[PDB]
């Protein structure tokens, strides 16, 4: 059963969680090719692993910048989790290491680019196109949540398309192993659950709200709560009001009403029956969950590829030297990395 599968995956996860891999490569073992994106305290690059010729995505984080932004513990969470997980829609760490200046995490490369890019260009996805992606997220969150992990940054920017048109849930910067409630204000304004905004302790139910936002945005082409400034967005999210496009199916609207539910006693994914309330909803009635997990379903969209290491599905970012100081920075802070 699913329960069985998950139990065993947890045994696998806990062993790596309790004894994390460390220092499993070195920078000189990789050829850096192109920046695939940026964040506040680093960048992700396409790299080639020279001894194998494999391409990977290499996340390069500036330790001093991580410290300035108070993201030390969050970054230690990310690496510790990602080295421990294993799931068809995640990119676990193939290698990790650090030097005087930076932290490095090497992951499976997703050549199709961000879902965001394709969503914005095409405008909106059909309900079937949306459901295909949504299904993969439902399973991933089932997996993560069963490991007592909370993900906390679902959005199209953070869903990478692979060569077969399936997705990888990336950007584990805010992911945290927590059994009770937690309090950190983090995520992306459009995707924040009202509990987070209202400075309440919160739990994994915020990931199910975020799912509601994502399915809406995918199917509408814009999110349920938007404005020019965050503060106006926060006002809309808390208010208790959402409007659906007239082209939204009846089933879709009902699912979204149950995901975008301010009342935790009523929010799908948070009830007694957990994720099955989502899996067994009518909007998912055509979804064969095993076929999705097995990646046997035909993707409704598969990206264009010239070949290995092709990056045409990514935007261009300014390239900047990777400089390695002669002095070790922030040694104690990142001792366990």
């Amino acid at each position: 059963s699913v329960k069985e599968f998950l139990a065993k995956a947890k045994e696998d996860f806990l062993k790596k969680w309790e004894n994390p891999a460390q220092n499993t490569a070195h920078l000189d073992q990789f050829e850096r090719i192109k920046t695939l994106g940026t964040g506040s305290f680093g960048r992700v690059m396409l790299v080639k692993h020279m001894e194998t010729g494999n391409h990977y995505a290499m996340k390069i984080l500036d330790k001093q910048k991580v410290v300035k932004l108070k993201q030390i513990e969050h970054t230690l969470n990310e690496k510790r989790i990602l080295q421990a997980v294993n799931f068809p829609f995640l990119t676990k760490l193939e290698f990790s290491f650090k030097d005087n200046s930076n932290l490095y995490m090497v992951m499976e490369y997703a050549p199709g680019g961000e879902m965001f890019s394709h969503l914005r260009r095409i405008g909106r996805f059909s309900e079937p196109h949306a459901r295909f992606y949504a299904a993969q997220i439902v399973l991933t969150f089932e997996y993560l949540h069963s490991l007592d992990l909370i993900y906390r940054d679902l959005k199209p920017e953070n869903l990478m398309i692979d060569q077969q048109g399936y997705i990888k849930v990336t950007d584990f910067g805010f992911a945290k192993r927590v059994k009770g409630r937690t309090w950190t204000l983090c995520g992306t304004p459009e995707y924040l659950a009202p509990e987070i905004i209202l400075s309440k302790g919160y739990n994994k139910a915020v990931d199910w709200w975020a799912l509601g936002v994502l399915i809406y945005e995918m199917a509408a082409g814009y999110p349920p709560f938007f404005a020019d400034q965050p503060i106006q967005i926060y006002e809309k999210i808390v208010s208790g009001k959402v409007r659906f496009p007239s082209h939204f199916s009846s089933d879709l609207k009902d699912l979204l009403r149950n995901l975008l539910q301010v009342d935790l006693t009523k929010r799908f994914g948070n009830l007694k029956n957990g994720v099955n309330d989502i899996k067994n909803h009518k909007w998912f009635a055509t979804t064969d969950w095993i076929a999705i997990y097995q990646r046997k379903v035909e993707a409704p969209f598969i990206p264009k590829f010239k070949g290995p290491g092709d990056t045409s599905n990514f935007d261009d970012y300014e390239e900047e030297e990777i400089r390695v100081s002669i002095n070790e920075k922030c040694g104690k802070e990142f001792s366990e990395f």
Binding site: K70, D153, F174, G187, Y222, F226, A227
Partner: peptide, 20 residues
């Protein structure tokens, strides 16, 4: 239209993560 209001907004590009 809501679409037009979105496209005319300042938040159609990549959205940054927030944290306290």
């Amino acid at each position: 239209t809501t679409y037009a209001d979105f496209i005319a907004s300042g938040r159609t590009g990549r959205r940054n993560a927030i944290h306290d």
